[PDB]
Amino acid sequence: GKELVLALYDYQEKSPREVTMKKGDILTLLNSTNKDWWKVEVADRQGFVPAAYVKKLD
């Protein structure tokens, strides 16, 4: 993924495959094939966060 999304809420990772984000963060959308969990890159960290908690910038 190369597109960006905006974190709508803070989100602390709850499992090994998740990643933490803060509201306002601009993340790189890595994979949105799953309806519920999108893989994103926050700073230099990658992982899944709830899809509904981020908003595509496009």
Counting Cβ atoms within 10 Å, is residue 55 exposed (0-12), middle (13-18) or buried (19+)? exposed
Q: What is the torsion angle, in degrees rounded to the nearest 10, for the CA atoms of residue 12, residue 27, residue 48 and residue 33?
A: 150
Task: For the chain, give every domain's residue range.
Answer: 1-58
Q: 24-47 burial string, b = 16+ CB within 10 Å, else e?
A: ebebebeebeeeebbbbebeeeeb
The count of residues in the chain is 58
In degrees, to the nearest 5, what angle opens at C-alpha 30 toward C-alphas 13 and 46? 35
Which two tokens mark 11?
A: 């989100």
CATH class, 1-58 region: mainly beta
- CA dist., res. 8 & res. 35, Å (int): 17
Specified resolution (Å):
1.8
